[PDB]
Structure formats: structure tokens, C-alpha cells
Design a protein around this ligand. Structure first.
Ligand SMILES: Nc1ncnc2c1ncn2[C@@H]1O[C@H](CSCC[C@H](N)C(=O)O)[C@@H](O)[C@H]1O
Ligand SMILES: O=S(=O)(Nc1ccc(Cl)cc1)c1ccc2c(c1)CN[C@@H](CO)C2
Length: 258
């Protein structure tokens, strides 16, 4: 896969998945509103807290941390590709060419209902993201030997990574076992991913993906030593079925390392 990922174009990836129609946040039935709503509700339970958090395979996106950032003062973002870490850098440092996530920040504020202005939410994320490190979930030690990242983390977040870098279920299970080592016992894992997908595009790159089911993800979490606190499925409607992939749904898993 690492080979195919050498052609991965962040801008194309962003455009394919986070720009209209999939990125439209006005229609309450879209995947965008559904996902932000499920990230906000999880953190609103007050049960997912601590000091440090690590986002596994962040790619060029930050939406997965909008609701999470107000609960963890030290946040580590990561990704296998340097081009993605650079794309993140552009938004974090507010440099030219950064992707504009303002509609997402605003919706997270809208959903959270704490009366927070979106600039303050983005300010807080930028402030708490202490570093952006390389990572490889295929390695028993994903971050490596002496990573600047505070370990073990009190919580992990990973969206669309594992199944997208695993050729099969068994390999999926190992990557999960792998990243699980980065988590403090009793800690929390918020895993988001593509259901029954076999490929997706990112510019000249065409990636192979392992198609997994909700049941398969649940059992994998259980086998890695987690207690599944919540599991949800969003079925991808026809209007969101574009030619960028063959994903059937999106899953969300809130797991607790026991
Ligand atoms: N071996 C590996 N270990 C960890 N991440 C990897 C990887 N190989 C590829 N990746 C990264 O996994 C990501 C899958 S796309 C998901 C991006 C983002 N988390 C989102 O929610 O959209 C890409 O950023 C890709 O570079
Ligand atoms: O759900 S999405 O259609 N877009 C989306 C997700 C979250 C929000 Cl907040 C908004 C839009 C979405 C986002 C990323 C990926 C997909 C779908 C499916 N392919 C994966 C890579 O395998 C990558």
C-alpha cells in the first residue's frame, strides 16, 4: 500500500470527501452533520477526558478533532505521508493555501451549543496540537522508538486509516493491535471508518481498501482488548455516491481499553 500512497494527492482527497456534496453541512441528513454530531455527543458525556490525545493517520484533515480539542491540552497529530503532514502544517500555521475548515468549525460550535464562536474553537485546536509526527500503523511501535509524543496517551482518535492501509481483515486486526499499544489502559479510542469499501481515489493515486462490516469492526475491537461503549452506522445515500470510491457506509466506534 505504501507504494500506492506515494501518489496520494491531499488536495484531491480533500476535494473528493470534504467538499460538496459530502462536505455540505447545511442538510441535516448528510454525513457531515451526522459525524460532527456523533463526535460532539461522545465528548459531551464527559467520559472521554485526560491530558494527552493522539490522532492516528490524520491525513490532511482536522474535523475529527474539533470537538475533542477542548478536552485534551496536549494533542498529537500524525500521518504516514509527508505531503499530508505539510498540508496540516499549512492550516495549523495558517499559511497560504491551507484548506478552509471554517464551515466545519462553525458547525461543531453550532452542535456543541456552548455559544462558542468558531474562531475560538479553531484557536484552541491550533493551540493544543503540540506536534505532527510521522507514523506507520504497520509497525509494532507505530510512532517509533523515542517519539516526542507523550505515551501512553489518555485517548486515541483514528478516522478512515486502518481499513485504508490494510489489505485484509487479519492485517486490519494487527494495525489495531499496534495502535492500541499507544493507549493507556482504561483509555478511550474513537475509531471512524469506511464500511464495505474496496477502493477510493486521491488524484493519481488509487488505493485498495479492505471492506469491513460493522460486526467485523466490533469483533476486532473486542479482540484487541476493548469494551465497545458505542457503535453507529451511517448508510451512504445515493446522492453521496460519487465516483471517488465505492464506500457503502461510515462507522463510528467508541471503545474503552479494558
Ligand atoms: N502505514 C500507514 N500508517 C498510518 N497511516 C497511514 C499509513 N499508510 C497510509 N496512511 C494514511 O492513512 C490516511 C487514510 S485517509 C484518512 C485521512 C483522515 N484521517 C480523514 O478522516 O479523512 C492517509 O492520510 C494516509 O497517508
Ligand atoms: O464521510 S465522507 O463521505 N466525508 C465526510 C466525513 C466527515 C465529515 Cl465531518 C464530513 C464529510 C468520507 C470521508 C473520508 C473518506 C471516505 C468518506 C471514504 N473513503 C475513505 C478512505 O477509504 C476516506
Amino acid at each position: 500500500v505504501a507504494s500506492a500512497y506515494q501518489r496520494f494527492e491531499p488536495r484531491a482527497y480533500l476535494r473528493n470527501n470534504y467538499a460538496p456534496p459530502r462536505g455540505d453541512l447545511c442538510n441535516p441528513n448528510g454525513v457531515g452533520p451526522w459525524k460532527l454530531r456523533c463526535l460532539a455527543q461522545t465528548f459531551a458525556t464527559g467520559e472521554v477526558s485526560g491530558r494527552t490525545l493522539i490522532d492516528i493517520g490524520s491525513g490532511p484533515t482536522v474535523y475529527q478533532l474539533l470537538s475533542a480539542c477542548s478536552h485534551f491540552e496536549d494533542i498529537t497529530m500524525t500521518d504516514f505521508l509527508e505531503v499530508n503532514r505539510q498540508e496540516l502544517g499549512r492550516w495549523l500555521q495558517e499559511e497560504p493555501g491551507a484548506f478552509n475548515w471554517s464551515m466545519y468549525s462553525q458547525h461543531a460550535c453550532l452542535i456543541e451549543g456552548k455559544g462558542e464562536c468558531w474562531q475560538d474553537k479553531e484557536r484552541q485546536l491550533r493551540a493544543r496540537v503540540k506536534r505532527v509526527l510521522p507514523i506507520d500503523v504497520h509497525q509494532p511501535q507505530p510512532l517509533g522508538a523515542g517519539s516526542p509524543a507523550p505515551l501512553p496517551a489518555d485517548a486515541l482518535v483514528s478516522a478512515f486509516c486502518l481499513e485504508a492501509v490494510s489489505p485484509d481483515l487479519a492485517s486490519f486486526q494487527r494495525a489495531l493491535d499496534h495502535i492500541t499499544t499507544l493507549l493507556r489502559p482504561g483509555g478511550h479510542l474513537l475509531l471512524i471508518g469506511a464500511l464495505e469499501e474496496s477502493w477510493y481515489l486521491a488524484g493519481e493515486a488509487r488505493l485498495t481498501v479492505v471492506p469491513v462490516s460493522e460486526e467485523e469492526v466490533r469483533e476486532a475491537l473486542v479482540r484487541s482488548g476493548y469494551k465497545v461503549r458505542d457503535l453507529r452506522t451511517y448508510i451512504m445515500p445515493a446522492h453521496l455516491q460519487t465516483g471517488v470510491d465505492d464506500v457503502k457506509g461510515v462507522f463510528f466506534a467508541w471503545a474503552q481499553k479494558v
